[PDB]
Each structure stands twice: as structure tokens, then as C-alpha cells.
Amino acid sequence: ARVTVQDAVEKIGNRFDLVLVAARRARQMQVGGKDPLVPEENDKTTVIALREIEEGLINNQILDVRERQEQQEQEAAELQAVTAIAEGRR
Amino acid sequence: RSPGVFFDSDKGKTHSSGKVLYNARIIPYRGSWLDFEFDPKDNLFVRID
Amino acid sequence: QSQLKLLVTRGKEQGYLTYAEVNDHLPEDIVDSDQIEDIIQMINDMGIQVMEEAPDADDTDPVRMYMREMGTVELLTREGEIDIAKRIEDGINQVQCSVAEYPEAITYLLEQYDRVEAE
Amino acid sequence: HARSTGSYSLVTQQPLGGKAQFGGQRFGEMEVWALEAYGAAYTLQEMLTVKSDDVNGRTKMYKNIVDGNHQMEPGMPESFNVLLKEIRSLGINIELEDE
Amino acid sequence: DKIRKVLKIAKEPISMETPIGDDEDSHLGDFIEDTTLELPLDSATTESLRAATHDVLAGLTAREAKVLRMRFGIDMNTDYTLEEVGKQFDVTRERIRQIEAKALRKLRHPSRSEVLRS
Amino acid sequence: TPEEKLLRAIFGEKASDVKDSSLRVPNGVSGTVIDVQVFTRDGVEKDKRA
Amino acid sequence: LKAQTKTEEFDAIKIALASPDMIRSWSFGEVKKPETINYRTFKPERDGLFCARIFGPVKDYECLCGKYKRLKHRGVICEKCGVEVTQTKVRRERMGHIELASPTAHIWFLKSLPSRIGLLLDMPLRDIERVLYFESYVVIEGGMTNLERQQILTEEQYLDALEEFGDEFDAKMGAEAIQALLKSMDLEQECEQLREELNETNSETKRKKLTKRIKLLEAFVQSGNKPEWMILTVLPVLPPDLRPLVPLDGGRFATSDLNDLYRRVINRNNRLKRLLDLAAPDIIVRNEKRMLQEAVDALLDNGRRGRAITGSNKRPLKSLADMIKGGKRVDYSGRSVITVGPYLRLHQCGLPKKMALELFKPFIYGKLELRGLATTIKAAKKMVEREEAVVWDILDEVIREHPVLLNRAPTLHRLGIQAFEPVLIEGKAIQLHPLVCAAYNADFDGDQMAVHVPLTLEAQLEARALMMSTNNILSPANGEPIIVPSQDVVLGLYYMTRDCVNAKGEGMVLTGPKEAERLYRSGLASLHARVKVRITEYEKDANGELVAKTSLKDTTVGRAILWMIVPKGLPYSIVNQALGKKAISKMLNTCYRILGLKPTVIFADQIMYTGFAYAARSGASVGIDDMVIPEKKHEIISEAEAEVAEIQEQFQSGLVTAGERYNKVIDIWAAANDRVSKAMMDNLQTETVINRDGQEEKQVSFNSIYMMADSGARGSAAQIRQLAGMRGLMAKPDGSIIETPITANFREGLNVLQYFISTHGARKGLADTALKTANSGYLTRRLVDVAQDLVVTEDDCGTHEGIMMTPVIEGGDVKEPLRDRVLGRVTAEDVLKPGTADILVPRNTLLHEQWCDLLEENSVDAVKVRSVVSCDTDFGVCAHCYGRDLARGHIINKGEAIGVIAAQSIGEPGTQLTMRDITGGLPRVADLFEARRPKEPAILAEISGIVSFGKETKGKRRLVITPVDGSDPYEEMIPKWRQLNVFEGERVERGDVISDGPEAPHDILRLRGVHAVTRYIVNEVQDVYRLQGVKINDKHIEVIVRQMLRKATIVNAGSSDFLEGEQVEYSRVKIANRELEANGKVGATYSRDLLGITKASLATESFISAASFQETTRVLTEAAVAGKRDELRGLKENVIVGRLIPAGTGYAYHQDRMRRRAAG
């Protein structure tokens, strides 16, 4: 996708929303939990995210949902500390 | 512009209607400007410097 | 009348905003840096209605206005000056005597002198 | 000419040089037209703040670059903060209220 | 020389708003660079320097890290001397200087702080 | 800064109360010196090279 | 439960007056001394303009004296000197104040066009308000006897009036007098009584001043500001760093002028304070008070009245206002001279090694310390400073898929900045793709371009998905391709066609690719013969896919091999059967509309490579013998000079009108010029003979020069005609034409005389070029200033109305058709069909579906289409109503930025517009947009009635026409000057011509209709683009016409107050919310109003936006009087504040924050 990027706007209209979502994903790779889906092949995270959108996986609703499950994983799994702090100030 | 005196044109529309309004000017080498110009009513005016 | 009629009828709209025109068609002492901004503000921008706000608004210098009030000479002679000076000394003497009338001014000065000699 | 980061004027924290490096390229009105048309919000965003005259921003974002984090973290460019004080220096008051 | 210093007080002097190269449009105060600010490069290295030292004192012992840290006064503001450190560690003066020199001995192979020098 | 104070302490202080402002050839260009010149102040110790 | 008291996110900014206490809130101390820096220690004085206790410390964390040094005491002040030891930037943000003795008038609210303090008080500016506060004529402050309430008295009048009454009407003079005047003023009670009195039995002889002030008085009281704040008692001080006195080189300090100002105001102020304690002679103190006035007024804003000089400079001093009244340098930047790079792709550019090294310095550092190599950050710097081989490879890594966008000097349109993928090149010059070299309008005369590095992550994605050159295939102005092959390549593909008879020809047939082996292996030529081969075509229909079609066509060697480049689809062969000229781009366009992006992009690289190679193979040159003169030249010239000779002899013997024989002999030479021009062209065109089989035949000259002209590549008729023909009629500085055309040509010698004649043409050519080049941008600024705020929003609304689009027909008496003006256009609603059905409602006319509008024959030449002119949208533009025309093929993406793209496209071709019943040129375009009345405006019938004379010249007067019918009459005024067009008694319609002259758009919009006026503007502005021959879509003209009709004027009775001319934005949104709110009778009917670009742009919501272009001293002032607030949606004002642009990549951000600001 190092020359459009046109195949991606087809999967999600408005080239602007495309930039927002792919950068969102590209941010996920560059710093934090990487884990791309399409093989890297020596490409920057800028385009790796786009390769995914073109491939058909990782959209706007997709990312938001995995964020929901991510929160339910960070929160629900480690609630033993939170509840312990809840009894702190009664 | 060369010193001395010359009568300038100012021809064409200068106040609508369109009527000449010729004007003279004296340009000194070391001094002040001395002008003489007409008006629509054909009066004569002077501009010192 | 003069300024109002000349300004309006001429400027319609003078095309390229002929500034160097009606400014000569204005009275009073010319070549000022005060009357300048008051013409560049009306012509364009808020046209039509601005040209009616101008006349209704038309219906200067520190030093020149200072010499004006100083213009009130009221100069003096050796007689005049000494007269004024005499009234000054006259006023002053009555004040001190009025102060001398005050016993606590003497007693305080006395109290503060003993303070002076006490170092 | 080419410039990553150099000196800045005391008055306005904008890039300038000629003593060791070269003062970075000038943007302007003609170019901000183009960026707005494309929809390059973040490019114009950076190109107006951290990339130019954001005191804390440029340093904050440069550290993020060497750390390989990108992002941005912008802030009010001093080319607007100065205006607040210059306007406030006059009898007129401008305040940037929350919501 | 007294006369020389006198001439260094003359004139207003010049104002920044003065046009210079007569561009579009020049002002003397626009060429004035800032020097109180530090280069982002310089600021980045200082941070990495903090990380460098904060990581090197880890490969040291407590009775050696605290010794090096407290003497040259780092990450604790007010730096102390041989006595104020010799009192808090029983053995006074020479003993603590012995350890202080031993820690410096340790830093003769790592390259991190070496290149950070220049 | 404390960390720097430690750093010079580990590699030798020599912390001169002087800076540096030597005239250096700007990065990129390169050539050969064909003439040097020195205009000394009238009342200043002239240099060896001068 | 928020109420946070920190520097968080703000949704709006407010502007209003500042109370003396308001100023005190910012005060971190009071400047009391004019002293700046020490004469010896060079240290900040005690309470001077540069205090350390008041403002900030000099050094970062050490106090003034030195009791405290390091970070130990960053929150505690010093013992010996109250110096808060934090930063030095504190010295950059701290305020401070001076507290004057007697009050002082603010120069702005005093003398800034309308006297705010006067009009609020109803009182003359430079007349009465001057003589009353300069201590000249004392004013009153309310009296219950004899004296009114605001009359002006002299000293004599004062004591006389005082002796008569006194001790019960006390009224001071000067500054504090106007204060008590503004303070005593009751805005509330006056707002009532002004409403009562200015409504009682008064026609239009008063309503003017009545409506004006009552709206103004109502505004100020509701603004929140108390008129007390008008003249300040406490003047705040600017932070020191924003006006420093920094030592330059070897002494010689450099300060700002504000220090001169602040120093003067303080000195004059203290003398004032000292005199208000000593003997107080009225003349001495009053003068000093006037001098404080002078000082303060000069510091705030010089302007204006003499200009305070001093500072040794014969130039004035830069006051506060002058420092904010009326470019943005950036890091990570560079520039260099550009050079062509044929070996590149369409998404690639040649970026120099040393250039790219210093540009990605922060990226190289990070990646180095990331991999290993460098032990630390400072290790990397020393590592790249010593360019160490390995570093270059890491550089090859960081620029991999990191787009860098290029920029040229004159950025007229969007294609001024385009992104590419960085390619390392051993050189110090920047190389560019020869296709997008036209979009930039860039040549290699020595032109130099700039480069920028998208640092931000999404800033890279903005560059790749938008500003990347591969996404900009089509022009935003006109749907046609912009990266279309130019001179070198096109002559290349033209040389790859051009069927030449025989000459190593013959019809030896094969199958495509094998022919390539034939061409390299000689034997056969290349431009022959024709010859036949097997063409395997591919076409699709209905269910798409691909349908093969092998056959045997008669192409040429060139057409055969060139076919290999052509993509999978396409009509095939026939696209190559023609040649290379304009269809060279036509081929590219069709490929894009039938294939897509990628197939078209690669196709361009291929067609580019092809042209250059085969053109290089061709080797077309230009020897002196390439430009052949006709033999009949000397013949034709003699004949013309024979004819003109007969005419001069006639003029000699009277006969013909000698007054205009000049015109007729000019026609002779003009005919003569055409004769040589036609002869030269017919000769140089065909010629040749060849020898096909049995010899004797004719084609077209292979005369290099001709080939270049018959294939774009900078070669037009006029230039050619000057090469071999003759330079025709030449202009004279007078503007007249010389009656002796340059008979000779550039092929021949040129006499010293005729060159000294042609020198005038060149001078006025370059010079006129210089004017219209800057005048073009002068137009674009106005176009953008008014339009750069509207963006396609609320998706796609309802509504069906829209201008009936029809082919621009001058064919009434000249025959000239153009019917492509509907494509990518959204249908109004099922636009009929000679029978039934057909076109849908909102179906956008496809590129293939407009070609279907020919299958319905020449019968259907009228279709209603949704336009930005209509569209019942609110503060934006419906996506459907717009179209699609971009570099992209679909409809405009929701939240684009129509305005700027529109303006750019319109003011881009301004470079090629010649300034002058036909004005013509760029100036003509301006007048249509400004909506100016012609020098001889025609007249129209407002209401349809029966025409009759209304008292023949009985005024005044001047004729009078009165069309009365049905009910009520009208009396139009004809000024005798200029005739008529309708006799008495005749009936007219609603808007008929009765002057048969130039039409005024104001009347057209006002009477004829909105569709009419917009149709007029578009079809009249286009007519000046036809002549210049510059293609530009009608949409963008419609777009600027959209907000060219932004506001209107209401005429009836509603929640809005009648005479007020308000925009249909608030109007429609409020009239829709009144029919079903309480009653439609609490609202009126409005009326669209035509206002020019400037007059429209003048009006805008943000006060920050206005302060951009228009007079800041005015806008900031008036917006200050009423408590106004920008909040905060505009583009321009949201740029200077330096945040996300409410459109494009943003938009989503603003919408979320826009809805977010609904809780409170």
C-alpha cells in the first residue's frame, strides 16, 4: 500500500476517517502492544496499518471493540487491588 | 525629471465627464514646487511646494 | 454645506479613492497628522451608510494649547512683584503668629529640644 | 539548506540561524491554503505549533522523536500568547474561558 | 581605559524596530537570537544523562551508590560532605573516601558515560 | 548539574572558568588557506604569529 | 462537580473592557521608576520597567542578590529582596501595573472612527469631546435648572452660571469629568426612554439615528461592561521579555520602543503626582495632565496625532497597537534547486544525501540508539556528525516509507504541495518527477523547491493519503488529468504513431510483443506502413469482468509496441491508432474512469518511460533549414504593399475618407499577414513526396518543428508564423498599430528599425506579465477571505431545486456548443425522457452515464441539477448538492473544504488573463464578483403592468415610466440620457428590459431571481475564461456565489428587528423554528441580497478572523465594547490560535467538541 491507499478508502469511506483510524492503529504498533496482522516485510507502521485496512481487518468499530475488551481485561482481571483500595477510606 | 518648467497633460477623465484640465509646473534645482492648475469651472489654482 | 456637499457629490466614488483631492478643499491650518485617519476610515468598508455617519460626526496640540492659557499675561513690575511678595510675607507671618498662639507648639518644641540635648 | 533544530529569536520563539546552522524554511499564507484544502489537519497542526514556535512543544516532541514515539502534544504557540499580553497590555481584556 | 569604559555608556542606545537590510520588512530585533533557551538536542542529552547515571548507580552496592550519590549531591538536592556522610555511616572521613574512590574505579570500562563526556 | 559534576569527577575535572568561541570552517565547504591576517588593537599585546 | 482552576482546554475566548480592578488582578507589582537597567552592574533596578521582584528573575533559578541559588528555594521568595525564584520565562508572562493620578482617556475608545465614548454619550468627537477634556471648555453633568445636562461652558459662562445658581449642578472638566459623565449615565433608563421617544409620530425622517443608537445602547448594557472602564485609572504593563533590552555585540544594547513609551508615561505621571502635593498652579498641573494624556495615548497607539518621535530615530515609535496591526518559519525544513529525474516513479523524488541526513537528524538519532551502534544519544550525534558509513544505511531505513512533501514558490492551488517517497541521491540538488512538474508550474530555469518532513504519525498519513502525488491524478479545478505527459514525452508518443508510407514498411504481420524484436532487429522501419498484426483486445460490459477479442487490425510498428504499455481494459488499438497530441491525455483520462487509480498510475510511468526512450531514439532536432519560408512571401508582400500604395494615392487625390484610411490599409496588411501565415502552414504541413511502391504520393512533413507543434510540446501557430512567416501588425506605445508590419521573420535578418518597434511589445509583455501575476494573487486573497469557512456537512439533505443546466450556446449567431457541464452532478429529480422513466432522483451523472445522455439524442438538452447555489443546508454544504470533481473520482468526502479548493482553482489561471461593450480579462472577473453596477445600468420592470409616461419631465425630470396593473403603481425615473425600448400603452412582465443595456446583478437577483443572478454570474465569468481558453468548472463559481448571497434583509415583523440585514443562516433556522414554536406571525419574510466578495467577507462571526484581514484597530475595538466571544468554529481564527482545523482530518474532532459543549 505504498502507492494508495485507494483500496483502503473503499473499505472505509472518507479518506479523512481513513487517516484517523490507520494512524490510531499505526500508533498501536509504533509504541505499545505491536502485533501486526499482515506480515511486515520491512514496512513502517505508517503503511502496515493501511495494509491491514486493505486486507479487510482492523476498522473503526473493530478497534473500539478490542479497546472495550482490553479495558475489561485490564479492569476485571485486576479488580482485587481496586476493591482493596475501596475499603481504604471506608 | 529636468529642472525648469513644463506644461503637463493630465488629459482624459479626471473628474468624469472628461475635459482636459491642463496644468503647468515649475521644478527648481534647489527649492520649492510652484504649480498652476485649472479646475472644472476653469479657475486657476497654485500649489506652493 | 460647503464641506458636506463637496465631499459627497465629488466622491462617487472617486474610483481609485483619490485621497489627494478634497483634503485641500478643507479649511483651518492644513498639513496636520490628525485629520488624516478621519477620512481613510469613512470612504470604503462601510460604504453608503458610513457617508451619513461622517457629516453627523463633523456637524489638537499640547504646546499650542499651553501657550494659549499662558497667553493670559498679567505681567508685573517692580511694584507689582514686591506687592505680591509683600502679601506672601504677610500671609506667612500670620500663620507663624497663629502657630505661636498655640501653646502646645511651644511646649512640644520644648519637649523635643530636651530630646535633642538628651541625644 | 536543511535544518532539524537550531536557534530562535528572543522576541518570537521562531527558528533562525546563520551563526552555525540555517534558519528553517518559511511557511506562510499561500501554503496554509493548500494544507486546509487537502484536509491535512495534523500536518497544519504541527506546522503551526510544535514544528515552529511552541516553546515546550518542540522540546517535548523532539524527545518523543528520539524515543520513537511520534505523536505530538501541542500547546498555544507564543505567536498567540504574545498577542494575549499585548492586547491585555492595552485597556482591553481578553480571557480564554473554559466551556 | 577609563575613557574607553565611558564610551560604553553613551547612546540610548539603538532600538530593535530599526529596519536593516530593508527587506519585507527587516527589523534589528528580529535577528536577535535567544541564548537563555537550551537546544532541544542539549535538553534530550541531559535527560538521557539522568537515565545514564540513574542506571549506572544500580550496578553498584547500597553502601557505594548512596555514597557516590550523596557526596556529589545527586537526586537529593543538598549535597553533603565527608563528615555528614561519615557520621551517618559510623566510620568517618577516610573510610568513606576509600569507598568513594572505589566506585570511581568501577567506572573504567562502561562506555555510556564515556561518550556522554566529550 | 549534579550528574555532570559526577561525570567530570569520573573522568577528570579540568573545569576551566573559560568557554570556547574559535572560528571554525562551516560544515560542508572545504578549501585551502591562501592568506591569514591580524589587525591588533592599538595597545594590545601583539601575537607571536602576528 | 468540576470547576477546575487550572490551565486546561478552552472552548472559546471572550473580549471585553477591563475594570481598574481587572487590571489589578494581573498586577504582580507596581512599576514606579523609569529606571531600566543599572549603568554599572547591568542589573535590574528596584521598581523599574524591569524589576526582578515584580516580574521575574534574570537567571533561571538564582535570585537577584544571591542569597538563594540552586533548586533548594524554588517556591520561597528571597529575604533581602522579594524575588520569587522559579524560572526566567516567568519574566515572559508576568504583567504589572502603573496607577495614574488623574484619569486618562483610552485612545481607542476615544478617536477610532466612531467615537465610542461619544456615541455612547451622544457627543461630538474632535469637536466637543476634545475641548472638554483638554482643559478648554468645561462640561456639565446634570442640572435641574437653566442648564441642560451635557452643554459645554467657557470659563466666563461657568462662573456666570455658577453665580446665578451654583452648589447644586456641579460639573467638572477634563478626563475625570467625562468619567463622571459616563458613570452618571444610566444605560437602563435611557434604553427605555429612547425607545419611547424615538417611536412617536416620526416617519423615515428620524428612524435612521433612532434604530442605530438604540441597538448600540442595548448592546453595550447587555455586554456586561460598565462605561466606567472606558477611560482607565489603572494602566497595565507588558511583560519585560516581550520588550527586552538585550546587549548585542560588544556593548551596544538593543531595546524595544515600549521602554521609551513606558519610561515617558511614568516620568510624566510621577511629575503629575508630585505636583498634586506641591503648589498646584492650575495652568501647570492641567498642562502636565494633558502631557500624561499625550504619553499614554502614544504608548497604547501612536497613529494618529503627530506621532511621538524621540529615541534619536527620525522614525516614529512602535507602540502596542502598531505591533499587532496589519512569515511563520518552521523546523525540519530545507530547500534546493530542482532537477528532472526520468528514472523516478510518480510517487518518488530525488532527495540529496547530505540534505536528508540533516533533515532526519532526530530520526537517525533515535534509530541508532534503538538498534545499538550508539551507546547513547550524544553518541549518535558524534556518530552522524562524523558521517560513518553505517549511518547512511540507517538513513536508508528511516526514510523508507516516510513521505516528504514538496513545495514551490508560487502556490496558486492545492497541487503546490505534494508528497513523495524519499529517494537517496548522491548530489546536492533535489530531483522531481517530470509528470507533476506541470502541476507546480515549475521549470528548470533554476527554480528551487522546499521540502518538509511530516514528523507526526498521522501527519505522515495525511501526507500519504491526501498530499501524496499519486492521489492527485486529476485537477481539482477541472476533472481532467493534471499529471498528463508534457513536451518531451508527447513528441515521443507522437513519433510512435504518425503512419509513414512504405520505406522499410510492408505488411508483414505478427502478434504484438514479437514486433518489438522486429524493431530492434532493424530490417523493418518503425513509422510504417501501415502494417497488420493481431490485437488481443479486452472489454467489459454489464457484469463487468473481461471479454477477450482477438483480431487483425492495420496499425503501425509504433502502435504495435506501444500497445504493450496499455492496461488490461480499454478499447485498445484505437487509442493508439490516432497519435499523440491532446488525446494523449484523453487516453489517460478514460483509463482512469474505466480502471481506477493504480492501473492509471503505473500506466503513466510506463507512458512516460515510453515517450522519453523513443523520443531519444527519434532524435528530432532543429537545424536552420527546418523552418522553411514560403516562396510567395516576397510576392504576397509586394501585392499588399501594392494595394496599400493604391490607397495612399487615393488619399492623395481625396476620394476615400483619409480620416480612417489608416484602418483599411491595416486590414490590407492584416489580410497580407494571414496570406503568408496560411501559405507557410500549407507548405510546411504536407510537403514531402516519398515514393510508395510506384512512387508519387503525399502525407505530412516530418519537419521536426512541425512535429513538435502537431504534438503540444510548446509549439503554436503564432510562434511558428513568426519563425518563417512574418511578425504581423506591431503595437505602438500609444496603443495604436503601426502601418508597416514586420515583413521579415526570425529565419531572416531583422532591421534595427523593426526591432526597435518589436521591443515595445516585449517590454509591455513582460511588464503586463508582472502586473497580472501579482494582481492574480490579489484576487485569490479576496476569494479565500470570504469562502474559507464553509465545508461540506450534514451529509446529504433533502430538497430538489437547483439550476436547470443547459449547454452554453453562443450558437444564436456564431455557433459554439459545450455540453459537458453536467457530469459528477447529482440529479435534481427524474429529469424526464421523450417517453417515460429513465433518469432517477438523486443519481449522480456518471462519467459513463453522461455518455448515456447522447443515446437520448440531441433532444434532451435540459436537466435540473442540485447546486451549492440552492441546497437547504444550514451552515455548510450538502454532499449530493456538490458533485464529486476532485483528483478523486467519487463524490466529495464529508467534511472536505470546498471553499479553499474553489478559490484556488479560480484564482490559479489568473496568471493567464489579459487585463483589457466588453471589458474582458481578470479585471472583468473582479467586477462580476464585486457585484458592481455598470457605468450605464439598464432598467427593469419590477411589477408587470401597462407602460405609460408619468408626467413628461415634471420634477426635476427627466422622463418617467409607470407600469401599473391589477393594483398599485410604480414611478421609475428615466434621466432623458439614453433612449428607451417600449412605447406607451404596451404591457410588460415581471422584470422586462426597458433600457436594452448592461444588466445589474443587484436588480437581477432582487427582481428576476436567485437562479437567474447566479446563472448570470457563472455564464458571464466563464465567458472571460473562454476567450483566454482556460477550463474551469462551474461548481466553484457557484460555491463563491453561495456565500456571495450569504445575508439578506427582512421585511415585515418578527423576532428579528426589521431593518436589520441578517444572514439566511440565522434567518432560515429561526423561521423554521417559529412556524411550529408559538406563531409564524412573530416572524417575517426575508429577501435575498447580493453583496460582493469584500462586502460579504467583511461580515463574519469570529472577531479573531476579522482581525486577520480587516483593520485590527477597528474590529478589536468594537468587538471589545460589546462582550463578544469567538467559540470557535472558523478555519482562519482556529489556525492563529494553533489548533486542529475544523475540517478534513479534523472535523470529527470539532464535531465531538461541538456537541460536547452542550452541557454548559
Ligand SMILES: [Mg+2]
Ligand atoms: Mg522558471
Ligand SMILES: [Zn+2]
Ligand atoms: Zn535573594
Ligand SMILES: [Zn+2]
Ligand atoms: Zn443539499
